[PDB]
Amino acid sequence: GAMGKPFFTRNPSELKGKFIHTKLRKSSRGFGFTVVGGDEPDEFLQIKSLVLDGPAALDGKMETGDVIVSVNDTCVLGHTHAQVVKIFQSIPIGASVDLELCRGYPLPFDPDDPNTSLVTSVAILDKEP
């Protein structure tokens, strides 16, 4: 697992990390975060990133790279990314969801995070190309 494959133990209680259970209001756009991972019932969801406009950043409790572990107290920890999307499809616009986010695990994929590689923040300077 190059872009993922963390320690998957299918139980939020057994996994390490910081765990914060925050409700994300599915607003008009729905959720202000994106996820990546959930590749398998053994690869985790993590917040690909979130819109600084959206409830995720606004709530403040959700950040880029937090591993989605659960939804509605239902362990959706790499349920399957297919299943997780289905559950969010299960949830309607204008809703909200108490989600379990584990933070501490590095971003699986880093699109909105500049900071990881080339074309990054200009406050991110390294002697390495």
- The Rg value, from CA coordinates, equals 15 Å
Shape descriptor: globular
User: What is the domain total for the residues?
Assistant: 1
CATH-level-4 superfamily name: PDZ domain
Q: Biggest sheet, in brief?
A: 6 strands, antiparallel
Subunit organisation of the chains: monomer
SSE order: EEEHEEHE
Distance between the termini: 25 Å
The helix content, as a percent range, equals: 10-25%
- The CATH class is Mainly Beta
CATH topology description: Pdz3 Domain
> Counting H and I runs of at least 4 residues, what is the number of helices?
2
Per DSSP E runs of 2 or more residues, the count of β-strands stands at 6
Strand content: 25-35%
User: Structural class, from helix and strand content?
Assistant: mainly beta
Q: Give the name of the CATH architecture.
A: Roll
